[PDB]
Amino acid sequence: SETADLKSLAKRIYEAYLKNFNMNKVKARVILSGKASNNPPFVIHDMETLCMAEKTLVAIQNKEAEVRIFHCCQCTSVETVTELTEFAKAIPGFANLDLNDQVTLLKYGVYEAIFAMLSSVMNKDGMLVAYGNGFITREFLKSLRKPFCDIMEPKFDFAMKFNALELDDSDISLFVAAIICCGDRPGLLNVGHIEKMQEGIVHVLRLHLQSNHPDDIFLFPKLLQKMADLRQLVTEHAQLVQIIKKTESDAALHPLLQEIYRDM
Amino acid sequence: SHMEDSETADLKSLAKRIYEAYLKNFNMNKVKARVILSGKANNPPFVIHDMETLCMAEKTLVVANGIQNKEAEVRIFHCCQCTSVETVTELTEFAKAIPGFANLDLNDQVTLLKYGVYEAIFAMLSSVMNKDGMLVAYGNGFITREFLKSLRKPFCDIMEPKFDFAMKFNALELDDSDISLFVAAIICCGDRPGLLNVGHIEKMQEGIVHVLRLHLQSNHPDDIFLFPKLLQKMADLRQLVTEHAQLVQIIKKTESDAALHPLLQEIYRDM
Numbered sequence: 240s241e242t243a244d245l246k247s248l249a250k251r252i253y254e255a256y257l258k259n260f261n262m263n264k265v266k267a268r269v270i271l272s273g274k275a276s277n278n279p280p281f282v283i284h285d286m287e288t289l290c291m292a293e294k295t296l297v298a299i300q301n302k303e304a305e306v307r308i309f310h311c312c313q314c315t316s317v318e319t320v321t322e323l324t325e326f327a328k329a330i331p332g333f334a335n336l337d338l339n340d341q342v343t344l345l346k347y348g349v350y351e352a353i354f355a356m357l358s359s360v361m362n363k364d365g366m367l368v369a370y371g372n373g374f375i376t377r378e379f380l381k382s383l384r385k386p387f388c389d390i391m392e393p394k395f396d397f398a399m400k401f402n403a404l405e406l407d408d409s410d411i412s413l414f415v416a417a418i419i420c421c422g423d424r425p426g427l428l429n430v431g432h433i434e435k436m437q438e439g440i441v442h443v444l445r446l447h448l449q450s451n452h453p454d455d456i457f458l459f460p461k462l463l464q465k466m467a468d469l470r471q472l473v474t475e476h477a478q479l480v481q482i483i484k485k486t487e488s489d490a491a492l493h494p495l496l497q498e499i500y501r502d503m
Numbered sequence: 504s505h506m507e508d509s510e511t512a513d514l515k516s517l518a519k520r521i522y523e524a525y526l527k528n529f530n531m532n533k534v535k536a537r538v539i540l541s542g543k544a545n546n547p548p549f550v551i552h553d554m555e556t557l558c559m560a561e562k563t564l565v566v567a568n569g570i571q572n573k574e575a576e577v578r579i580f581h582c583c584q585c586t587s588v589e590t591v592t593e594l595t596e597f598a599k600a601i602p603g604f605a606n607l608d609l610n611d612q613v614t615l616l617k618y619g620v621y622e623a624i625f626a627m628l629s630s631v632m633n634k635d636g637m638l639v640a641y642g643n644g645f646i647t648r649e650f651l652k653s654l655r656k657p658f659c660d661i662m663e664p665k666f667d668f669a670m671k672f673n674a675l676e677l678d679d680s681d682i683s684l685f686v687a688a689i690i691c692c693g694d695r696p697g698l699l700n701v702g703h704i705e706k707m708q709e710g711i712v713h714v715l716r717l718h719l720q721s722n723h724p725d726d727i728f729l730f731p732k733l734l735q736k737m738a739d740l741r742q743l744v745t746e747h748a749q750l751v752q753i754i755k756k757t758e759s760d761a762a763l764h765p766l767l768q769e770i771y772r773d774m
């Protein structure tokens with residue numbers, strides 16, 4: 240045993256994952272079963288059901304129904320950004336880094352990470368919203384007017400492909416941690432150590448997937464591709480967001496998310 | 504007041520003569536298709552969702568004589584054509600059965616058909632589709648939309664746009680009585696280029712359009728504006744077909760193992 244060091248680290252990240260994230264694949268897959276355990280979610284398929292949801296599920300009414308979704312989306316992503324930061328701090332090594340390195344990894348990582356975890360609450364028909372109490376159809380999102388329907392579709396594409404890997408929360412913890420702890424991110428200060436720290440989380444991820452998915456020994460290689468597809472997905476997302484802000488008159492970009500995009 | 508007059512018994516006759524012609528000449532219809540999809544029909548469809556079930560399908564559904572060893576995308580491509588060629592035939596027989604259609608100039612019979620057939624195929628294709636996939640092989644098969652997306656460019660760009668159409672179209676909750684009339688109005692279009700007796704064909708559409716109007720008002724008095732909604736769909740199909748005409752040519756012009764059926768070639772020549 241020298242890897243007894245590593246098997247440890249894997250639980251430390253995954254505990255941090257279970258702690259700092261209210262929404263997880265195992266919880267999300269149980270909800271959408273039909274083995275609902277209590278009440279099932281509430282489905283949104285159009286207006287009527289949307290505005291019944293905007294009643295019972297949120298805290299708006301003045302505005303068009305497209306921007307309601309657009310704004311609601313940011314409420315969720317900001318919460319998640321917060322959860323992601325608390326999770327980043329609970330990664331061994333992350334705290335040790337320059338303050339301005341802790342901010343940069345987080346800047347370029349959070350979205351790649353949001354969309355990877357977003358797959359957990361998506362299937363082909365829709366996604367789990369409002370803390371898991373709601374569910375909005377993919378169809379409904381596509382049957383919204385341009386350019387707002389071009390928003391969510393590409394993420395569904397990603398998720399279907401992603402959930403085909405049939406990863407679990409233990410895999411997703413390490414995977415997400417490999418996304419945050421990335422040495423590519425422009426403007427890093429201690430580039431060499433972030434890399435040594437990456438190559439370390441990458442190692443445990445590789446071996447974990449080999450214990451958990453012996454049935455596909457090439458899963459890790461495939462996650463490195465998904466990591467690639469995520470960076471493009473985010474670049475793509477950056478622009479669809481820019482555009483909607485610089486055209487659509489009632490489009491309100493939260494100042495935190497604005498900053499994240501600043502100099503994308 | 505008044506019982507039913509024969510100026511409008513002529514109309515329920517038309518909507519009646521057309522509907523039967525539709526049942527006579529189309530092997531697949533919306534009533535059949537939904538029964539097959541609910542699994543309330545009795546060895547149900549066979550799901551295709553990967554390479555294995557694709558290949559193990561062609562074995563027990565179509566074995567390929569002159570295709571056995573091609574790629575996987577080009578199989579679907581060719582497979583698709585067998586179905587549409589079989590549909591054009593069914594569409595032509597159905598067109599011969601529309602009152603007035605046989606009476607038209609022989610060239611006019613084939614021009615209305617040239618421009619109508621794809622508009623009608625995709626309109627009717629909606630019957631065999633849901634959000635997940637579509638019925639294939641005379642009903643006995645089923646292929647995931649998912650799987651059709653999970654092919655490469657530009658092959659996976661073919662079938663998606665028709666799923667967009669169909670989901671919106673099926674939301675109109677139309678039935679075979681409506682579709683029969685709608686298809687007839689598609690074929691009988693006074694709009695199509697190079698027509699030889701444009702005035703009579705105009706008049707002919709107008710009659711079929713008028714029957715469709717009142718039939719929709721009867722069978723769907725809950726959406727009194729179903730008819731206009733359907734006029735929009737005609738438009739949506741013209742462009743769906745147009746876009747489709749160009750992705751086919753691309754796939755012909757580029758993809759070196761993409762054969763276009765010679766009947767379909769002729770059809771496409773000039774759109």
Ligand SMILES: COC(=O)N(CC(=O)O)Cc1cccc(OCc2nc(-c3ccc(Cl)cc3)oc2C)c1
Nearest residue numbers: 292293296297308311312313315316368369390496
């Ligand atoms: C611009 O919006 C986005 O596409 N995103 C937010 C961002 O850029 O920060 C991406 C994104 C990230 C995470 C989740 C997300 O969508 C969640 C989400 N939540 C709703 C919604 C609408 C009404 C009610 Cl009552 C409840 C929920 O819709 C959606 C798509 C969307």
Ligand SMILES: COC(=O)N(CC(=O)O)Cc1cccc(OCc2nc(-c3ccc(Cl)cc3)oc2C)c1
Nearest residue numbers: 560561564579580582583584586587639640661767
């Ligand atoms: C070029 O092919 C096409 O996209 N089309 C044909 C054409 O243009 O004439 C459009 C089209 C028209 C009508 C139906 C259609 O889809 C039927 C269809 N049938 C299959 C298939 C594949 C393997 C097996 Cl074993 C069985 C069936 O796939 C598809 C899409 C597709």
